[PDB]
Amino acid sequence: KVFERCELARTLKRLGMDGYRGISLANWMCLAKWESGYNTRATNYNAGDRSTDYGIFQINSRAWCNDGKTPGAVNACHLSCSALLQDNIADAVACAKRVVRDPQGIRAWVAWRNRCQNRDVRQYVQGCGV
């Protein structure tokens, strides 16, 4: 599903993401925007290390979800990677909350460091009534 911006903002709000581990909704929105363009079907295969990034948050198959074909997989979210390609993002959100309970928090996604850290990210939630 490709979410519309404010549609995704209200869905994340409902799912308890605003201020989760100190992270604002605008920061989660900046992350999904640059990771997938708000597209739940996004996958990215990383040929160098043989892992794949899945879904709207581009969560990786080595550390977080299991797809059966990644060497060294840990499956810290205890989730099949296919659960992250659903139109319903409740599972992608529970796994994304697991990723940020690690010390690094949202910095785990390098795309957030490149495009969102120390930038004004409030335009991602402006006008969504969130």
UniProtKB/Swiss-Prot annotation:
Residues 1-130 form the C-type lysozyme domain. It is an enzyme of class 3 (hydrolase). It holds the Pfam family Lys. It is found in: Secreted. Disulfide bonds join C6-C128, C30-C116, C65-C81, C77-C95. Its EC number is 3.2.1.17. It comes from the Eukaryota. GO terms for cellular component: azurophil granule lumen; extracellular exosome; extracellular region; extracellular space; specific granule lumen; tertiary granule lumen. Keywords: Amyloid, Amyloidosis, Antimicrobial, Bacteriolytic enzyme, Disease variant, Disulfide bond, Glycosidase, Hydrolase, Secreted, Signal. GO terms for molecular function: identical protein binding; lysozyme activity. The active site is at E35, D53. PANTHER family: LYSOZYME C. Lysozyme C is capable of both hydrolysis and transglycosylation; it also shows a slight esterase activity. It acts rapidly on both peptide-substituted and unsubstituted peptidoglycan, and slowly on chitin oligosaccharides. Belongs to the glycosyl hydrolase 22 family. Lysozymes have primarily a bacteriolytic function; those in tissues and body fluids are associated with the monocyte-macrophage system and enhance the activity of immunoagents. It is linked to Amyloidosis, hereditary systemic 5: A form of hereditary systemic amyloidosis, a disorder characterized by amyloid deposition in multiple tissues resulting in a wide clinical spectrum. AMYLD5 primarily affects the viscera, and the predominant clinical features are renal dysfunction of varying severity, and intra-abdominal bleeding. Inheritance is autosomal dominant. This is Lysozyme C.
